[PDB]
């Protein structure tokens, strides 16, 4: 589906994607979100990092991906006691406040980088479980290397999966977001179906809770045949295809998968560039590279190779002169009048965003296009 001109460019963007991610990986193994963006620099997210790590693992850099998993594992083992205390509080009928929960931002030395009152999220822990299991399977690795950190994440998610939290976008703490539920589900199914983990004390529980997540989504997270952004809403969010691939609420051929891809395309995809959600005013609500990649990945997995390629091409067209991929671009803005104030406050849009590169690597690999 690609000529020599396109292939050369796509190959080069893959090589550069690998290079930029590994150049900016912290000494301790964390992947930063964006080394030069004011509001993100100095911090790591499990969400960004897990997708970045999966792109790097697919690319074949076992060493780099492993160092990320090492970093996460060690950070989580350090929270063994915090998690045990949260669980003990629950058992005493004293449910912890959001202010006491595990963090969203991490410093590179594994401390809280932000206050969870303001950004409490559970998705990243689910993503990490998915990521580490997938990596180990791909490369034939012994999960015992990372198991104690897996155990912390599992225990935490089994307790807290059903709690309201902010979405991937740091919005709406009172709601239960389907792509958050989906991320947790993906992680739980990954560990619950992993033969190396068959004897873990939580083995059966992970699949039972995954089933509970699917029940909740069936009851409150599907409208008019499609997934919705949060339980009890009617609208879609551009994150929702992740619920299909990779997180597996439904398979790619399911009607709800098809309808969800179609709804996201219709409501949020403009010319190949996918918006986050209709009300998005962040930088005016631009078109997100990672979301176009996510949709493309989902299209590839459904057999729509042409649609996948169209989204891959759109992403490639957003690379700057150095090959760096921004977080988002303003070719179409949902709320154009809101962009200037973001630029004025926080600077120009995060570029490179490592997650953009990670997602590019995943989509490229899905289409057989890694060099």
Active-site positions read 167, 170, 327
- Quick one: which of 357, 354, 356 has its CA closest to 33? 354
117 belongs to an annotated ligand binding site: yes
- Quick one: which of 160, 142, 138, 157 has its CA closest to 76? 157
Q: How far apart are CA 304 and CA 302, in angstroms?
A: 6
Q: How far apart are CA 369 and CA 371, in angstroms?
A: 6
The answer to whether residues 65 and 22 touch, using CB atoms and an 8 Å cutoff, is: no
| Helix orientation angle between 289-301 and 354-366, rounded to the nearest 10 degrees | 20
Q: How far apart are CA 291 and CA 343, in angstroms?
A: 21
Cα-Cα-Cα-Cα torsion 266, 14, 126, 276, nearest 10 degrees, comes to -30
The answer to whether residues 335 and 281 touch, using CB atoms and an 8 Å cutoff, is: yes
Residue 343 tokens read as 């630029």
| Helix orientation angle between 123-139 and 178-192, rounded to the nearest 10 degrees | 40
The answer to whether residues 354 and 44 touch, using CB atoms and an 8 Å cutoff, is: no
Q: How far apart are CA 128 and CA 26, in angstroms?
A: 18
The CA angle 100-104-106, to the nearest 5 degrees, is 105
* Whole-Å CA distances, 218 to 221, 223, 226: 6, 9, 10
How does 114-149 read in b/e, with b if 16+ C-beta sit within 10 Å? Answer: eebeebbbbbbbbbbbbbbbbbbeeeebebeebbeb
Q: How far apart are CA 236 and CA 268, in angstroms?
A: 8
**Number of other CB atoms surrounding residue 279 within 10 Å:** 11
What is the SS3 assignment for 110?
coil
- Quick one: which of 257, 296, 256 has its CA closest to 273? 296
In the annotated binding site, the residues are 117
């Amino acid at each position: 589906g690609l000529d020599s001109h396109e292939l050369a460019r796509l190959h080069e963007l893959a090589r550069h994607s690998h290079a930029v991610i590994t150049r900016h990986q912290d000494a301790g193994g964390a992947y930063p979100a964006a080394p030069t963006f004011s509001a993100y620099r100095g911090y790591a997210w499990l969400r960004d990092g897990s997708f970045t790590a999966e792109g790097i693992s697919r690319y074949g850099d076992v060493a780099s991906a492993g160092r990320f998993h090492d970093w996460v594992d060690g950070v989580l083992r350090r929270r063994r006691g915090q998690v045990d205390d949260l669980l003990a509080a629950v058992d005493r009928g004293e449910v912890p406040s959001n202010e006491g929960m595990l963090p969203t931002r991490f410093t590179f030395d594994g401390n809280d980088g932000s206050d969870p009152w303001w950004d409490f999220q559970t998705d990243g822990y689910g993503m990490w479980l998915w990521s580490v299991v997938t990596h180990a399977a791909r490369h034939g690795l012994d999960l015992e290397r990372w198991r104690a950190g897996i155990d912390v994440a599992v225990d935490y998610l089994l307790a807290f999966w059903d709690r309201p939290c902010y979405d991937w976008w740091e919005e709406h703490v009172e709601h239960r977001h389907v792509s958050t539920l989906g991320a947790i589900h993906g992680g739980l199914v990954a560990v619950g179906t992993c033969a190396a983990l068959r004897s873990a004390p939580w083995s059966a529980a992970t699949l039972q809770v995954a089933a509970r997540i699917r029940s909740l989504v069936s009851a409150e997270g599907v409208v008019d045949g499609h997934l919705v952004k949060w339980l009890g809403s009617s609208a879609v969010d551009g994150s929702l295809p992740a619920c299909v691939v990779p997180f597996g609420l439904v398979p790619p051929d399911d009607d709800v998968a098809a309808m969800t891809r179609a709804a996201v395309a219709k409501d949020l995809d403009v010319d190949g560039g996918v918006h986050r959600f209709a009300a998005d005013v962040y930088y005016g609500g631009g078109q997100w590279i990672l979301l176009s990649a996510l949709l493309g990945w989902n299209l590839a997995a459904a057999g729509d190779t042409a649609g996948a390629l169209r989204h891959l091409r759109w992403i490639a067209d957003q690379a700057d002169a150095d090959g760096d991929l921004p977080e988002q671009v303003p070719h179409h803005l949902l709320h154009p009048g809101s962009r200037a104030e973001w630029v004025a406050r926080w600077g120009t849009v995060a570029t490179p965003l490592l997650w953009s590169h990670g997602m590019y690597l995943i989509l490229a690999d899905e289409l057989g296009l890694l060099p």
